[PDB]
Amino acid sequence: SGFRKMAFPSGKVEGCMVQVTCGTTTLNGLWLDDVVYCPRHVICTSEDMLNPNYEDLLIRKSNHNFLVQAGNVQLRVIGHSMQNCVLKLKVDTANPKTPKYKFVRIQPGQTFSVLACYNGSPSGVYQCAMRPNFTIKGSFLNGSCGSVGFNIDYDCVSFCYMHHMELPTGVHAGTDLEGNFYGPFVDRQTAQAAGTDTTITVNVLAWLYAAVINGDRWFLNRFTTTLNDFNLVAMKYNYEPLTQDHVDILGPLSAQTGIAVLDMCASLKELLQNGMNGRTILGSALLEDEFTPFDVVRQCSG
Amino acid sequence: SGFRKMAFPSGKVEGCMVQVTCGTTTLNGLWLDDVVYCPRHVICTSEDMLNPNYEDLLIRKSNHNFLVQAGNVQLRVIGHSMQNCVLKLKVDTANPKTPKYKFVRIQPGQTFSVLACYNGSPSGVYQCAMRPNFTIKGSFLNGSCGSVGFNIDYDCVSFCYMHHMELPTGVHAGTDLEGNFYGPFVDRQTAQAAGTDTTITVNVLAWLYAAVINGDRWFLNRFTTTLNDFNLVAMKYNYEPLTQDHVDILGPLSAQTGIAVLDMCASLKELLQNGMNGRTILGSALLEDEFTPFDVVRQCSG
Numbered sequence: 001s002g003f004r005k006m007a008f009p010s011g012k013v014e015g016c017m018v019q020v021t022c023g024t025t026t027l028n029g030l031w032l033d034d035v036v037y038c039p040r041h042v043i044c045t046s047e048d049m050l051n052p053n054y055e056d057l058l059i060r061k062s063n064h065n066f067l068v069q070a071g072n073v074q075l076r077v078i079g080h081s082m083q084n085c086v087l088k089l090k091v092d093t094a095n096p097k098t099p100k101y102k103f104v105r106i107q108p109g110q111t112f113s114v115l116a117c118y119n120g121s122p123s124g125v126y127q128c129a130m131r132p133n134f135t136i137k138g139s140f141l142n143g144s145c146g147s148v149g150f151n152i153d154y155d156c157v158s159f160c161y162m163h164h165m166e167l168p169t170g171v172h173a174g175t176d177l178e179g180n181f182y183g184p185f186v187d188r189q190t191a192q193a194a195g196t197d198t199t200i201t202v203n204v205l206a207w208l209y210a211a212v213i214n215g216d217r218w219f220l221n222r223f224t225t226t227l228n229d230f231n232l233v234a235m236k237y238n239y240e241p242l243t244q245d246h247v248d249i250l251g252p253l254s255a256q257t258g259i260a261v262l263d264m265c266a267s268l269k270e271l272l273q274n275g276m277n278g279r280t281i282l283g284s285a286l287l288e289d290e291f292t293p294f295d296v297v298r299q300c301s302g
Numbered sequence: 303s304g305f306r307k308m309a310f311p312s313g314k315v316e317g318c319m320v321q322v323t324c325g326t327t328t329l330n331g332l333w334l335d336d337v338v339y340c341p342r343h344v345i346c347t348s349e350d351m352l353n354p355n356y357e358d359l360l361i362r363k364s365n366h367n368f369l370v371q372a373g374n375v376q377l378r379v380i381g382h383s384m385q386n387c388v389l390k391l392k393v394d395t396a397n398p399k400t401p402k403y404k405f406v407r408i409q410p411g412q413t414f415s416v417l418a419c420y421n422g423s424p425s426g427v428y429q430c431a432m433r434p435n436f437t438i439k440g441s442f443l444n445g446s447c448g449s450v451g452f453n454i455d456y457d458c459v460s461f462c463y464m465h466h467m468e469l470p471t472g473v474h475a476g477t478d479l480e481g482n483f484y485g486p487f488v489d490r491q492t493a494q495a496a497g498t499d500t501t502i503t504v505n506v507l508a509w510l511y512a513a514v515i516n517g518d519r520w521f522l523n524r525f526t527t528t529l530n531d532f533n534l535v536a537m538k539y540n541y542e543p544l545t546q547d548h549v550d551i552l553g554p555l556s557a558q559t560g561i562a563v564l565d566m567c568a569s570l571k572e573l574l575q576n577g578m579n580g581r582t583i584l585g586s587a588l589l590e591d592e593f594t595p596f597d598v599v600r601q602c603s604g
C-alpha cells in the first residue's frame with residue numbers, strides 16, 4: 001500500500017553523465033557509445049547567448065576548443081556536428097557503461113524521471129510530467145543545462161528530454177535528444193512565454209483510481225455521466241477534454257476496481273463543482289494530474 | 303527555480319541489491335564487501351511467520367539452505383549469523399561495486415531515499431521522512447521486504463533503513479542496518495499498532511522558507527511571536543513543539559531570505575488558525591512536513 005511520487009532508478013543514466021566546457025561556458029552532456037550529446041548553447045560566449053548565430057559560431061571552433069570531463073578522465077574530442085539544437089561530440093573512447101537505449105519523443109501528459117546534474121555530477125532524481133503547454137514544472141538551478149529525462153522499459157533506457165532553459169515564470173523547457181524543442185521555444189537567452197496550461201484529465205482519473213485501490217472512497221457516488229456531459233463541464237474548468245482513447249487506456253484500472261470510467265467521471269464532475277471541503281485524497285487537498293494510468297498500474301500492482 | 307520531492311541518485315545502491323531465498327521464502331538483501339544483510343524473517347516458513355522462534359529456526363539451517371542471487375550469478379554462502387533482526391550471510395565473493403558506506407540510525411523528522419526492490423531488482427526511488435511515531439508513509443507491495451533507505455554525503459552512502467513490514471494502517475516499519483527496530487515493533491506477522499503521529503514543525507517552517515525563495519509570499523505578515531506563544535498554539539494542532547535547536551537549524555534559511563524564524567512562526571500560527579482559504583503554497587493546499595532544512599538548502603541553493 002501507499003502512493004508516492006516515484007522515479008525510475010537512475011544508475012544506468014548516472015554512468016553516462018559528463019561535463020562539457022567550451023571556453024568558459026560549461027554544462028552537462030550525455031555520453032553514449034563514442035558520442036557526447038549536449039545543448040549547442042555551450043558554444044556561446046557571454047556576448048553570444050542573447051542572439052547567437054550557431055552556424056557561424058560552430059565554424060570557428062576546433063575539436064580542441066571542447067573540454068569533456070568524465071569524472072577524472074578527460075575525453076579526446078575528435079569530431080563535432082550539430083543536429084538541430086544539440087551538439088554531437090565524437091570522442092575517441094566509447095563509454096563502457098552505455099546501457100541499451102533509445103531516443104523517444106514524449107507527448108503532453110506523459111511522465112518521466114529527471115536526473116538533475118551539475119558540473120557533470122548527478123545531484124537528485126525526481127518524476128515530472130510534460131505539461132500540455134510543452135513545459136515541465138521541474139526543479140533546476142544554474143548549471144543544470146544538459147540534464148536529461150528518461151523512462152525505463154525493462155533493460156532499455158528511453159531518453160526523452162534534454163534540459164535547456166528556465167522561462168521567466170520559473171518553468172522549464174528543453175528538447176528531445178534529436179535536438180527538437182518541445183513547444184514553441186528557441187535556444188537563446190531571451191524572455192519567451194509559455195502558452196496557458198490545462199489540467200491533464202486522464203491522469204486525474206488514474207489518480208482517483210489509485211485512491212480507491214488504497215482505500216480512499218469518500219468521493220464515489222451512484223451516478224454515471226456521458227463523455228459529452230463530462231467534457232462540457234471539464235472545459236469550463238480548464239481540463240483537457242476526454243477521449244474514447246483515454247477511456248480505453250483507463251481499462252485495467254476500471255477492471256481492478258470494478259468502477260466504470262464514466263462512473264468515475266461522475267465523481268470527478270462532483271469534485272470540480274463542489275470542491276473537496278477539507279477532505280483529502282491520497283494525502284492531497286488538490287486534484288493531482290502528474291500520474292499516468294501506467295504509473296498507477298506500475299506502482300499499485302507491480 | 304521550482305521545488306520537487308527529490309531523491310538521491312540511486313546507482314550506488316542499485317549495485318548492492320540481491321535476492322535471498324530460504325526454502326520458498328524470498329526477499330531482498332544488501333550485498334556489501336563479502337556480507338549479505340537481510341531481514342531474518344527469511345528463515346521463516348509459512349507456519350513460522352506468526353510466532354517465530356528465530357534462535358531455534360537458525361540452528362536448524364545450514365549454509366546451503368540459503369540461495370543468494372546477484373542477477374545471474376549465484377553467490378556461495380559460507381557462514382551465517384544473526385544480529386538483532388537482521389541476518390548476516392557471509393559469501394565467498396566480495397561485491398566489486400561496494401561503495402564507501404556507513405550504517406547510521408536516523409531520528410524522527412529526518413528524510414531519506416528509498417530504493418524499492420522486488421526479487422532483488424530495483425523498481426523505483428522516492429523520498430520520505432521518518433515520522434514521529436517511527437513509521438514511514440512509504441509505497442511498497444508484497445515482495446519489497448529488505449528494500450533499503452539511504453542518504454548520500456559526498457561519495458559515502460549512509461544506510462539508515464531496512465524495510466520489514468506493512469502495518470494494518472498501510473504505513474511501514476523497519477529496522478536500522480544493525481537490526482534494531484524503529485519504534486515499538488517486532489518482526490512477526492501479527493497486527494501491531496503505531497502510536498499517534500504528529501506534524502513535524504521544523505520541517506513545515508523549512509518548507510515555508512522554500513516557498514518564499516520561490517516567490518510565494520502571500521502568507522507573510524508584519525507580526526512576530528515568541529517560542530512560548532507559538533508552542534502553545536502548535537500543541538493545540540498536534541504539531542511537534544519547537545526548540546531553540548530547531549531555531550538555530552533554520553539559520554541559513556533565515557539569512558538567505560531576511561525573515562527571522564519567529565517572524566515565520568507568526569505566519570505559521572496564522573495558517574493554523576485561519577487555514578489557507580483555497581490559496582496554495584508551492585503547489586500544495588496542505589502544509590508539507592517532509593522536507594528538512596537541509597533538503598531545502600540542497601535543493602534551493604545547491
Ligand SMILES: Cn1cnc(Cn2c(=O)nc(Nc3cc4cn(C)nc4cc3Cl)n(Cc3cc(F)c(F)cc3F)c2=O)n1
Pocket residue numbers: 024025026027039041042140141142143144145164165166186187188189190303
Ligand atoms: C535557474 N535555472 C534553471 N535551469 C537553468 C538552466 N540554465 C543553465 O543551467 N544555464 C544557462 N545558461 C548558461 C550560463 C552559463 C555560464 N557559464 C559559465 N556556463 C554557462 C552555461 C549556460 Cl547553458 N541557462 C540559460 C540558457 C540556456 C540555454 F541552453 C539556452 F538555449 C538559453 C538560455 F537562456 C539556463 O537556463 N537555470
Ligand SMILES: Cn1cnc(Cn2c(=O)nc(Nc3cc4cn(C)nc4cc3Cl)n(Cc3cc(F)c(F)cc3F)c2=O)n1
Pocket residue numbers: 001326327328329341343344442443444445446447466467468488489490491492
Ligand atoms: C504489502 N506490503 C508492503 N510492504 C510489504 C513488505 N512485506 C513483504 O514483502 N513480505 C512479507 N512477508 C513475506 C511473505 C512471503 C512469501 N514468500 C514466498 N516469501 C515471503 C517473504 C516475506 Cl518477508 N511481509 C510481512 C512481514 C515481513 C516481515 F519481515 C516481518 F517481520 C513480519 C511480516 F508480517 C511484508 O510486510 N508488504
Ligand code: NA
Pocket residue numbers: 220221222223224263264266267
Ligand atoms: Na459515480
Ligand code: NA
Pocket residue numbers: 522523524525526565566568569
Ligand atoms: Na510575520
